[PDB]
Structures are given as structure tokens and as C-alpha cells.
Design a protein around this nucleic acid. Structure first.
Ligand SMILES: [Mg+2]
Ligand SMILES: [Mg+2]
Ligand SMILES: [Mg+2]
Ligand SMILES: [Mg+2]
Ligand SMILES: [Mg+2]
Ligand SMILES: [Mg+2]
Ligand SMILES: [Mg+2]
Ligand SMILES: [Mg+2]
Ligand SMILES: [Mg+2]
Ligand SMILES: [Mg+2]
Ligand SMILES: [Mg+2]
Ligand SMILES: [Mg+2]
Ligand SMILES: [Mg+2]
Ligand SMILES: [Mg+2]
Ligand SMILES: [Mg+2]
Ligand SMILES: [Mg+2]
Ligand SMILES: [Mg+2]
Ligand SMILES: [Mg+2]
Ligand SMILES: [Mg+2]
Ligand SMILES: [Mg+2]
Ligand SMILES: [Mg+2]
Ligand SMILES: [Mg+2]
Ligand SMILES: [Mg+2]
Ligand SMILES: [Mg+2]
Ligand SMILES: [Mg+2]
Ligand SMILES: [Mg+2]
Ligand SMILES: [Mg+2]
Ligand SMILES: [Mg+2]
Ligand SMILES: [Mg+2]
Ligand SMILES: [Mg+2]
Ligand SMILES: [Mg+2]
Ligand SMILES: [Mg+2]
Lengths: 49, 80, 48, 115, 50
RNA sequence: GUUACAGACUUAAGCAGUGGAGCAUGUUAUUUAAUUCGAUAAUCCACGACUAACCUUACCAUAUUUUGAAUAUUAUAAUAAUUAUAAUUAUUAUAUUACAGGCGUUACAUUGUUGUCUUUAGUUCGUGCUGCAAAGUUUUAGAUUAAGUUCAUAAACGAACAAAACUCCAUAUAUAUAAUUUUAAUUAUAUAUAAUUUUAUAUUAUUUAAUAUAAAGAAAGGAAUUAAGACAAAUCAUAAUGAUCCUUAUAAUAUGGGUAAUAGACGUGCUAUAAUAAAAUGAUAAUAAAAUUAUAUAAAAUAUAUUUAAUUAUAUUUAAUUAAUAAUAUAAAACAUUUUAAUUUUUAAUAUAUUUUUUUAUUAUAAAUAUGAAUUAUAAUCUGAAAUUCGAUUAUAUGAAAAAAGAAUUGCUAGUAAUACGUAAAUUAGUAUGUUACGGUGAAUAUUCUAACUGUUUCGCACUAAUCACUCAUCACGCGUUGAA
């Protein structure tokens, strides 16, 4: 899909920033389980129109 | 205590036994002010590594014990 | 902090019915077992 | 002795434990315990009006107090990690650790300093 | 009092870990159903925490 | 170790500096019982470290701990809470093993994060089309922009991560709220609106685009965001984890010492080398902003240094406020009078006079200061339990070097640089020449030539873990085969 939001692009509603660095619509996270080989992690990032 | 009021910097020592019988006082204090009550007592003041033997003269009365046990070795350069 | 805080030990005390699993502890135990298996276990401690 | 590192049996702090942290915490507890006493001794020592022998005795007592009674000995550690450099008092955290927490949203309000 | 606020947020963080620990169950060493949970959000009103 | 264009603090102007001096701080080297460990081309060197007396610390000397910080297993015993003298539980104690623990080693095992290329403009997917095909087109013939943003053209048409935009600060306007004693309404803060400005006349080049002029507007910046890839770039010392090694020791605690050692060297700074510049003074207290004060901010006033008093520094003692209310805190340069050696370019004795805080005459006034503040001596004070190694003030003395700095080299185009302009906080019990922040006053200059380094491009390519690439021959070591003799 896409990570830009087109509701903010052509309307009165403006985008806002969570902790002044994450576009409101975005939500980012990671979780780092240990393996036999060692450490690894899994970033996820969703957009939500 | 440096300031004239509230001084001197006093520490507990085996002083009276040294006075009775010449047994050197092995100090690891180094911040105890020398007093008039111990001039002519043998001190063995710590140097970090090894205890240093000193006989306290009347010129030392104002000073700290650690001032007479120099911790670092005298610097030199290996001219190579 | 507050030293009396709930721990995994207690999560057995409060709720015996629920068979909980502390994951980090279990992992550690598995690692220890693996070490024992391949001759890399801890040496037996001296008592004297 | 064997069963504990320090003289007094103190509890472990919750969350991140470390040897240095343990050492600090115990010290803080002992300071808290023997705060009033130390103050009283100090007062007795630094007195022009009181008998001199008494003030000397108080000074000796203060000198003989252990490592763990000393207020000056306390050092603000990070609570999340166990670091002791650039430890901000408003969230008892180390510099990097604070930043990590801040960006996540653990310090509720903290946020990026945009101006 | 910011000290108190700090103590509260520490507590909250500690509770999160506890909750995470709780979330994984066992059923007579047969099935280990790992319930995934989000990071908790703690709402501190004057009256009550939620 | 290649073409070609375009770009900017790249260069050129310009302003201030570094490079010389002394000090501060980091690094190196060497020293040391230990000088803990890492960072060490751009992309290390007031960096990790927003404060090394003890502690922090990891290092060293000497002491002393050995299931220790955890979790679980197995037993004896003791205390407390609950119930209606017994029991259930929770804990503690003594042990008991598995272990715990490790700033030990490897960021050439990792995570996360960060630096540099980089706010640079690149980095790719559906459908269609081209090529037997890997692939190509799209993603560019032009041009332009800050720009893979755009119009011209094109077998393409759309679509993503970047760019831009939304965001924050600041600005202008409107509305709301504040009984205008928490007032600063000249404010603060929520919610809007506002511009990546618009319009028209002309003059050049081809309906548009740059210049100029005009009328309409408060309309002009900064911050965050720094893609893909790469550099086996940095970090196992924020933290965590793989493997590996230590387990009476490479784990744990105390007392002291060290991290502050000093030949030479290297960065960053600070203070200087005096008159387009330094010092005294300036109470109807000339003019700020931003931020801190329950691990506090400390006002007024008294006392001593100090015959008046003010200043500055301590002590005495806490008024007020945990804060639009009180305190830190009368901002400072500015501007004004005075003084200022080098300077017989001045002074003081006489006269002198329509230059009188002054003039003229005649007499005598003969390379570091009345610059600088290193270095040291003594006395006090501050913090702390403790100031010797090893902290910060004040006083009385001490008064090095340094005469605007070689080749070379750093930052900066505007509220920027500059400033002998000050102010605040983070880290502290205590110490900023550092860091992060705030206002004050406020400039000079300007693009064409060449080095570099980024885009994209030309040509080449035997490289594809992709130039730390690939790769050629002798010589040296073994085991065959076939010649000559
Ligand atoms: Mg130049
Ligand atoms: Mg030189
Ligand atoms: Mg110099
Ligand atoms: Mg290491
Ligand atoms: Mg080093
Ligand atoms: Mg130590
Ligand atoms: Mg282990
Ligand atoms: Mg260690
Ligand atoms: Mg990494
Ligand atoms: Mg390394
Ligand atoms: Mg292509
Ligand atoms: Mg391209
Ligand atoms: Mg943008
Ligand atoms: Mg008003
Ligand atoms: Mg990138
Ligand atoms: Mg490497
Ligand atoms: Mg690397
Ligand atoms: Mg590791
Ligand atoms: Mg660790
Ligand atoms: Mg050890
Ligand atoms: Mg250092
Ligand atoms: Mg620097
Ligand atoms: Mg001057
Ligand atoms: Mg006052
Ligand atoms: Mg006030
Ligand atoms: Mg004033
Ligand atoms: Mg000279
Ligand atoms: Mg001077
Ligand atoms: Mg001066
Ligand atoms: Mg401290
Ligand atoms: Mg300024
Ligand atoms: Mg271009």
C-alpha cells in the first residue's frame, strides 16, 4: 500500500505529529525475540488512511 | 576541616601506646593534621602501595600526613 | 522504586489455578540445559 | 559476610538490578536511616558555644561513621539501565535511555524539541 | 510534585512487565497459548488510575 | 590515476579568527604499582563524560566475602497475620544443588541507535509495448527547478519510499477568556483565517518567461524531517543477546592511591599583547528575553575585610514563593564625565589673558607600563565526615611570556558574522575557560578563472564477495608424465 495520507493533502483537516515526530495516522513498533543464533527484531509500520 | 574555626582535622590513632613504647603508627589516613601532641612519634604513612616511615619533626606541625608520602614516582623519559 | 512490587513468584501465591509461564526464566533454564549437554556447564563451586 | 554483601539486609529495588545500583541503593537507605543522627553530630562539632571536649568527641564519631552513612557518597544512577553519566533528575534515566523512552512515549509528555 | 510523578511512571512501567509475564499461560504442559498484548496505557485521573 | 555540465560557504571578495605567547581542556607519546576502557582521515581529539576529592570506577596496593542480587528443588525450626488453645497461609532463619555474577573477548556473530555520502535526489511495481532472451521502455530527445517538482517530446498509462506539502517556532488579523490586585491587556492561550503571494503596464526573447515599473497586502525567516544503498564506519562501557572464556575468582565488600603523572608533539578553546580602547563612577536605579526554585530559590537588614558609605567577598538570619503572585536578578554593552604609560604630545614655579576644566612666554621636568596576569609566598573563607596527592573564593604581596603572530589554515551572506554585550539551566554537597539555551547592539562584502567533492552523464571495462576486484612469471615444497643422454 502507501504511507502518505490524501485526506490531509486536499482539505481543511491537517496532519499532526505524535511526540512531534510521528505522523498521526502512522503507528510504528518493534519487538526483539532472542534466537539460537542470537538477537533479532521485527519492525512493523501501518498507515491507517 | 581547613577553616581555622572548626579545625583541626582530627583522626583516631594508636598514639598513647606509641608514646609509651616506640611502636610506629601505621596510618592510612593521609588527611589527618599533624598535632603538637605527636612530634617525635614514628609514623608509617600509606602511599597507595607501601607504608612510608617518617619521624615527625616540629616543622611538620601544621601539615597533613599525606603531604609527606609522595604517591607517584618521579617522572622520566626513555630517550629512544 | 517501591521494593514491594508484584513479581512472577507471587504473576503462584495469589492465583494458583492459572499455570503461568515466565518466558525469560524458561529461556535461561533452556540455555543452562544446553550448556550442560555440550560440556560448557558451570564448574562445581568450591566450599572449603 | 557470606549471606549478604553489606552489613544490613536491605531489599532489592524493582526492575533493573545491577551491582553498582545495589551498592548505591543500600547506601541511600543507610543515609535515610541515619540522617538526623549525622546532622546532630555535625551540629555538636561546629559549635563555638558548646564545651570543646564534647565537640571533639562528636567530630571523632563523625569521622568513624561508615562509608554508607555519607550523603556525599550517593550518586544518581539511571533507573532503567545502571549508568551514572548524564543522569537527568526529572526522569531518573541516563541520556541515551531517556531519549529511547521519550521517543517511545514512556515519559507521557516529553516530545521532540522542534521550536 | 514531580518526584511523585516519576515514582508513578516507574510503577506503571513495572506493572507493564508484570502484565506481559502474566499474558502467557500453560495447560498441563500440553498447550502454551501465548496471548499477545499491546503496551499498556495508564490513565491517571485525580480519583483513579485506569 | 575518465568526458562533460550544473551545484555551495566550494572558491573569490569581505569580517573575525587559528598557526607565535601564557593558561584551560582533550589526544599522543613516554612514565607508573595503577596512570581504567573505548573514540583516533574526511565521518577522533571540552568525543563517549551535562561536573573523577570519597564515592562515581571500571584501574592499582592491602585486607576480607564464597549460592553470593535471582529463580527453582528438598528439608528442619521460629515469628506474625487471619479464624473458631488448634489450624491455614505468609515470611524469616540454617543448609541444599542447578546456578547467580562477570565494564572479560569478539559491533569482522548480533540488536537497537548513530556518523558520513544526505534535505542530497535519488530508490522501485502493476498493466501495456520492444527484444529469441537476461533485460529495456516507463525512470527522457528538450528545457527548467532547490528538486525524479514541473511543461515541450516520446510505447506508453497509472501507482509507492524519498522531494514538496501537511508539522513546530515566529508573524499579521479575527473570536473567545482574564471581575485589569497572580496584570504584563504594550500581555497569555485555545480556536480559526492568511501566501509555495496576487494583479496590471512596458521591454527582450519565443500563448508564455525573465527583467523593470506600478498598487494590493503584516507578509520576511528559522526548526524538525537527512531515502535506498554503501563505508564489515562507531558502539558488546546505555542496555540486551549469540558463541567463547573465569567460577575461593576474570564474581563481591572496605581502606588508601590512580584516572590530575610530564621530554617532545598534535588538536580544540580562554586570556592577552593599550587610546577607531582599557579602567573609576552613574539610586526619583536607561533599556531585555528565556528559564529555575519541596533532594529548594534565599530578599531585606546587621557584622567583619574597610572610618565614613557604596562597591565586591564572606559570616549572621530566613522575609516571601513552592510561583503569571516571592526569590534567583537594580541586565550588560550603550550613552556621559574622569583617567590613561609609551609621549618635554605632560607636569609645576612664575608671570601672561577676550581659548581660564584653558592659552602664551621662560625655567625645571632624562623597547613591557599606571599594558598583561602566568608563576609563587602568607593569611583567611566556602562545600563536605574528609580539600596531602586533588576542589572553589577573598585579601596582602609576587608581576613570566606576550610588541597582533611563518608556511599554511577555520567559521560566517543578515537579525547572519562580529561583539573587552550580558543573562539563564543541565550536571553538583562543591567547582565551567565546556555544554545547551536566551535576548541586546549590529556590519562588510558577491561569479568569474582553477583545485577538490557530490548529482547525472561520455568513453572504456578480461572486474560480478564487483579494484581490499581480477591477475602474470621466476624461485621454493611434494607427486606424476614425456624428451635429451
Ligand atoms: Mg575564501
Ligand atoms: Mg608552536
Ligand atoms: Mg599558542
Ligand atoms: Mg572492551
Ligand atoms: Mg584511552
Ligand atoms: Mg576506589
Ligand atoms: Mg552466564
Ligand atoms: Mg568488575
Ligand atoms: Mg550495529
Ligand atoms: Mg570497537
Ligand atoms: Mg533505468
Ligand atoms: Mg536514474
Ligand atoms: Mg518535506
Ligand atoms: Mg495591563
Ligand atoms: Mg540512507
Ligand atoms: Mg569493523
Ligand atoms: Mg560495522
Ligand atoms: Mg556480549
Ligand atoms: Mg552488561
Ligand atoms: Mg571481583
Ligand atoms: Mg580524561
Ligand atoms: Mg568539538
Ligand atoms: Mg587595554
Ligand atoms: Mg541582601
Ligand atoms: Mg517576582
Ligand atoms: Mg543598573
Ligand atoms: Mg617581552
Ligand atoms: Mg593589571
Ligand atoms: Mg584586565
Ligand atoms: Mg557527586
Ligand atoms: Mg546573540
Ligand atoms: Mg539535476
Amino acid at each position: 500500500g502507501t504511507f502518505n495520507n490524501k485526506k490531509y493533502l486536499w482539505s481543511n483537516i491537517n496532519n499532526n505529529y505524535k511526540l512531534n515526530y510521528i505522523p498521526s495516522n502512522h503507528n510504528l513498533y518493534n519487538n526483539s525475540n532472542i534466537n539460537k543464533n542470537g538477537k533479532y527484531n521485527i519492525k512493523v509500520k501501518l498507515n491507517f488512511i | 576541616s581547613r577553616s581555622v574555626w572548626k579545625g583541626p582535622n582530627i583522626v583516631p590513632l594508636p598514639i598513647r601506646e606509641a608514646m609509651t613504647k616506640g611502636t610506629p603508627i601505621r596510618t592510612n589516613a593521609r588527611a589527618a593534621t599533624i598535632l603538637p601532641q605527636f612530634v617525635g612519634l614514628k609514623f608509617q604513612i600509606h602511599n597507595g602501595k607501601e607504608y612510608v616511615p617518617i619521624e615527625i619533626s616540629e616543622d611538620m606541625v601544621g601539615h597533613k600526613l599525606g603531604e609527606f608520602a609522595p604517591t607517584r614516582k618521579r617522572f622520566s623519559y626513555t630517550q629512544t | 522504586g517501591n521494593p514491594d512490587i508484584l513479581k512472577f513468584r507471587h504473576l503462584k501465591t495469589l492465583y494458583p489455578d492459572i499455570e503461568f509461564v515466565d518466558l525469560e526464566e524458561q529461556y535461561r533454564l533452556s540455555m543452562v540445559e544446553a550448556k550442560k549437554r555440550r560440556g560448557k556447564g558451570a564448574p562445581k563451586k568450591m566450599k572449603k | 559476610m557470606g549471606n549478604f554483601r553489606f552489613p544490613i539486609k536491605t531489599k532489592l529495588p524493582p526492575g533493573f538490578i545491577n551491582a553498582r545500583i545495589l551498592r548505591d541503593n543500600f547506601k541511600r537507605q543507610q543515609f535515610k536511616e541515619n540522617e538526623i543522627l549525622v546532622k546532630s553530630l555535625k551540629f555538636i562539632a561546629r559549635n563555638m558555644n558548646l564545651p570543646t571536649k564534647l565537640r571533639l568527641e562528636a567530630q571523632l564519631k563523625l569521622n568513624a561513621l561508615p562509608n554508607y552513612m555519607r550523603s556525599t557518597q550517593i550518586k544518581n544512577r539511571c533507573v532503567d539501565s545502571g549508568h551514572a553519566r548524564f543522569v537527568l533528575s526529572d526522569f531518573r534515566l541516563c541520556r541515551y535511555q531517556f531519549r529511547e523512552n521519550a521517543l517511545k512515549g514512556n515519559l507521557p509528555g516529553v516530545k521532540k524539541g522542534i521550536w | 510534585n514531580k518526584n511523585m510523578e516519576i515514582m508513578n511512571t516507574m510503577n506503571d512501567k513495572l506493572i507493564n512487565k508484570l502484565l506481559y509475564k502474566m499474558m502467557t499461560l500453560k495447560l498441563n504442559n500440553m498447550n502454551i497459548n501465548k496471548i499477545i498484548m499491546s503496551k499498556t496505557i495508564n490513565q491517571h485521573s485525580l480519583n483513579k488510575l485506569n
